[PDB]
Every structure is written in C-alpha cells, then in structure tokens.
Amino acid sequence: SKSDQLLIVVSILEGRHFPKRPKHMLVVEAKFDGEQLATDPVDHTDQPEFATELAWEIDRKALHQHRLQRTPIKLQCFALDPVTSAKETIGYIVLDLRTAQETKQAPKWYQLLSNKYTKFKSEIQISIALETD
C-alpha cells in the first residue's frame, strides 16, 4: 500500500501587518497529531517572508478520519531574540483538513489569534495540500 502513503503539506508563505521589530526574528511552529515542525527564523519585518513547506506523513484511512474528526493543525507564532535565544508567543492559527485536496490550491489569509501585538491585524498566508508519499 505504498501508494496509500500521503503527505499533508502546509505552505506558509508571507505575513502582513506585523510590527517592524529590528532586533527580532519570527518562527512558526506547527503541531499535528503530536508531531512538531518549525520554520527557519525570518526577519521580523512588517511583511515577514516565511516561504516554507511543512510535511507530515499519514495513511489515507488515517487522513479521512482526521478530516471528519476535525483534528487541528495548530500553528504557533513566536518572536525570537537571536541574541538571548528567548522566544515569546505572539499568537496562534488553527487549520483543519477540510479543504485539503490532492491538488495545489490558492492560499488564504489567516489572522493570528490571541495576538500579542494588540493593535496590529497581523496575518499569515497559508496553503494546505495533499501529496503522494
């Protein structure tokens, strides 16, 4: 059943309406079904360039269950200090497999929930898709 092996691919593209923080970086961590993945740290500019794909392995039977159960893909956004190495949680984004098809789809803009930058309507552009593993 090698064919029945799939990848959930989350594409984190660009951010917008972030504050310009000259000494900091941004990192997005993503957690699905107890597996954590992370982006490179990127410049904490107003429009951060994440340009990263994250991939989790899954079975077709398992994927269909997660889809119906609404198992979340939880994205946590951190501001990182390259000097001290301290990370602070900026906000979170929740995705689910409802839209995930086996073709690439147009990305959508997602607002950061519990956003520490309370006056900024910070958001991150995200695609989700399924590929053969």
Curated annotation (Swiss-Prot):
Q: What domain of life?
A: Eukaryota
Q: Where in the cell is it found?
A: Cytoplasm, Cytoskeleton, Microtubule organizing center, Centrosome
- The C2 domain, residue ranges: 1-110
Q: What does this protein do?
A: Plays a role in the microtubule-dependent coupling of the nucleus and the centrosome. Involved in the processes that regulate centrosome-mediated interkinetic nuclear migration (INM) of neural progenitors and for proper positioning of neurons during brain development. Also implicated in the migration and selfrenewal of neural progenitors. Required for centriole duplication and maturation during mitosis and subsequent ciliogenesis. Required for the recruitment of CEP295 to the proximal end of new-born centrioles at the centriolar microtubule wall during early S phase in a PLK4-dependent manner.
Similarity comment text for this entry: Belongs to the CEP120 family.
Give the disease association: Short-rib thoracic dysplasia 13 with or without polydactyly: A form of short-rib thoracic dysplasia, a group of autosomal recessive ciliopathies that are characterized by a constricted thoracic cage, short ribs, shortened tubular bones, and a 'trident' appearance of the acetabular roof. Polydactyly is variably present. Non-skeletal involvement can include cleft lip/palate as well as anomalies of major organs such as the brain, eye, heart, kidneys, liver, pancreas, intestines, and genitalia.
**Subunit structure and binding partners:** Interacts with TACC2, TACC3, CCDC52, TALPID3.
Designated name of the protein:
Centrosomal protein of 120 kDa
- This protein's species is Homo sapiens
